[PDB]
Design a binder for this molecule. Structure first.
Ligand SMILES: Cn1c(=O)c(=O)n(C)c2cc(N3CCCCC3)c(NS(=O)(=O)c3ccc4c(c3)CCCC4)cc21
Length: 110
């Protein structure tokens, strides 16, 4: 274990708690959304983030936070504004920003 990776684990749990519908917990289902990859270059979701974390693919906070931001921005891009998904991504961006601000202040003074 390392202190940084433990912090990322805690931070990832805190971000997922904000996704009360669990709609970002797993990859957007390509079987239901067959054109998703037409529009979205790099899909992201909380399970893939956890897999990245446990595989040591986040050694710095920026790479981790950019993947969180990708969950949000992919959703805003794909979905019309008047959808449950778009509205949920906006709320996740707002509620997650505070989580990431406090967590980044911990990794920097590490
Ligand atoms: C295309 N899409 C996104 O762009 C996106 O950001 N998310 C986060 C999505 C997330 C899901 N779920 C959400 C449930 C958990 C499994 C993954 C799906 N599955 S779904 O069968 O199309 C579906 C599912 C539920 C509802 C609708 C579509 C339409 C509105 C009514 C509710 C597509 C998503």
């Amino acid at each position: 274990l390392t202190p940084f990776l433990i912090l990322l684990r805690k931070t990832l749990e805190q971000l997922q708690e904000k996704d009360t519908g669990n709609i970002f917990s797993e990859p957007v289902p390509l079987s239901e959304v067959p054109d998703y990859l037409d529009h979205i270059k790099k899909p992201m979701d909380f399970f893939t983030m956890k897999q990245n974390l446990e595989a040591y693919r986040y050694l710095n906070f920026d790479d981790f936070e950019e993947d969180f931001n990708l969950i949000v921005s992919n959703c805003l891009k794909y979905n019309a504004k008047d959808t449950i998904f778009y509205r949920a991504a906006v709320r996740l961006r707002e509620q997650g920003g505070a989580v990431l601000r406090q967590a980044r202040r911990q990794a920097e003074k590490m």
